[PDB]
Design an enzyme around this catalytic site. Structure first.
Site, PDB file in Angstrom:
ATOM      1  N   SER A 126      32.929  39.551  46.882  1.00  0.00           N
ATOM      2  CA  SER A 126      33.621  40.703  47.447  1.00  0.00           C
ATOM      3  C   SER A 126      32.659  41.772  47.919  1.00  0.00           C
ATOM      4  O   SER A 126      33.010  42.581  48.783  1.00  0.00           O
ATOM      5  CB  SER A 126      34.495  41.350  46.383  1.00  0.00           C
TER       6      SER A 126
ATOM      7  N   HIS B 269      38.294  48.682  43.874  1.00  0.00           N
ATOM      8  CA  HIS B 269      37.691  47.551  44.580  1.00  0.00           C
ATOM      9  C   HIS B 269      37.648  47.792  46.088  1.00  0.00           C
ATOM     10  O   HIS B 269      36.594  47.646  46.716  1.00  0.00           O
ATOM     11  CB  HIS B 269      38.470  46.285  44.205  1.00  0.00           C
TER      12      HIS B 269
ATOM     13  N   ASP C 235      42.594  45.081  51.383  1.00  0.00           N
ATOM     14  CA  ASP C 235      42.186  45.155  49.982  1.00  0.00           C
ATOM     15  C   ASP C 235      43.153  46.004  49.163  1.00  0.00           C
ATOM     16  O   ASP C 235      44.358  46.017  49.446  1.00  0.00           O
ATOM     17  CB  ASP C 235      40.747  45.687  49.901  1.00  0.00           C
TER      18      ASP C 235
END
Ligand SMILES: Cn1cccc1CNCCc1c[nH]c2ccccc12
Length: 279
Positions: free
Chosen positions: A224, A69, A39
């Protein structure tokens, strides 16, 4: 173990019903397993990770998560308050820049990195990789995910957020990995979640509270966010000895809550990740 006032998604994964707020899980908690979060990075200094997170690879000038994120996804895998597998080891691989963007060639290199790097880590209970990313169909990206899975890593990937058939996205469309769609707190398919025959499982994906950069927290939505629930669940189940990396996706589907989600298109599985923990 019981965690009161848990995020709804944690409570959901240990419940036969929506609308509860306590997460129940075996205290082994993924101890002895490892989860790679591929990520934007992980803010390993966040107190929520308790020293169990570290960055192992970056393709950019820093291994720091300048986005949030990756830190959010890692928190759902394994943070003390927001995580499914609260004692797993977390390894960050930064394939996405601080805007969340990355070249497929870098993402592929990162997957092959994990397949080798696990041989440099102590994960006696097994290894998982969580991939909350994707783009348009690419056979090379799918093949990289297939290799990572073949190497002995439970690969969980996001289905995508286009409200479309995931067959046109990668690595979502790779058959041999675990493709994860998103649901909300009322057991509805999340409005943005991709669907289709390539999906294996749904997890909580709408309004998911987790860690964020700057030592903070926030709630965001996406496939996600569903993906790390499944990755953490796999690590937890492997620590319990109930399944293996090769079989964990199938085991999770076998043991899922069945037929409880709404707005699932004909031909997409109606399966919601569930730990089947009996306190
Ligand atoms: C832009 N950005 C910011 C943080 C992380 C990102 C990268 N996007 C992750 C969400 C996603 C976009 N397209 C997909 C296709 C399949 C599976 C997941 C996705």
């Amino acid at each position: 173990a019981a965690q009161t006032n848990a995020p709804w998604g944690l409570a959901r994964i240990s419940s036969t019903s929506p609308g509860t707020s306590t997460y129940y899980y075996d205290e082994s908690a993924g101890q002895g397993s490892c989860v790679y979060v591929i990520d934007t990075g992980i803010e390993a200094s966040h107190p929520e990770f308790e020293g169990r997170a570290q960055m192992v690879k970056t393709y950019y000038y820093s291994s720091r998560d300048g986005n949030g994120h990756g830190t959010h996804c890692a928190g759902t895998v394994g943070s003390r308050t927001y995580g499914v597998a609260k004692k797993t080891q977390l390894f960050g691989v930064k394939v996405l820049d601080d805007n969340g963007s990355g070249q497929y060639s870098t993402i592929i290199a990162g997957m092959d990195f994990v397949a080798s790097d696990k041989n440099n880590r102590n994960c006696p209970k097994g290894v998982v990789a969580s991939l909350s990313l994707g783009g348009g169909y690419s056979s090379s990206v799918n093949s990289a995910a297939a290799r990572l899975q073949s190497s002995g890593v439970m690969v969980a990937v996001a289905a995508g957020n286009n409200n479309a058939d995931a067959r046109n996205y990668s690595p979502a469309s790779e058959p041999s990995v675990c493709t994860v769609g998103a649901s909300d707190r009322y057991d509805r398919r999340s409005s943005f979640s991709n669907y289709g025959s390539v999906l294996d499982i749904f997890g909580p994906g709408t309004d998911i509270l987790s860690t964020w950069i700057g030592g903070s927290t926030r709630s965001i939505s996406g496939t996600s966010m569903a993906t790390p629930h499944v990755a953490g669940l796999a690590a937890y189940l492997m620590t319990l000895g109930k399944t293996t990396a090769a079989s964990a996706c199938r085991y999770i589907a076998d043991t899922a809550n069945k037929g409880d989600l709404s707005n699932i298109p004909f031909g997409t599985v109606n399966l919601l990740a569930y730990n089947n923990y009996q306190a």
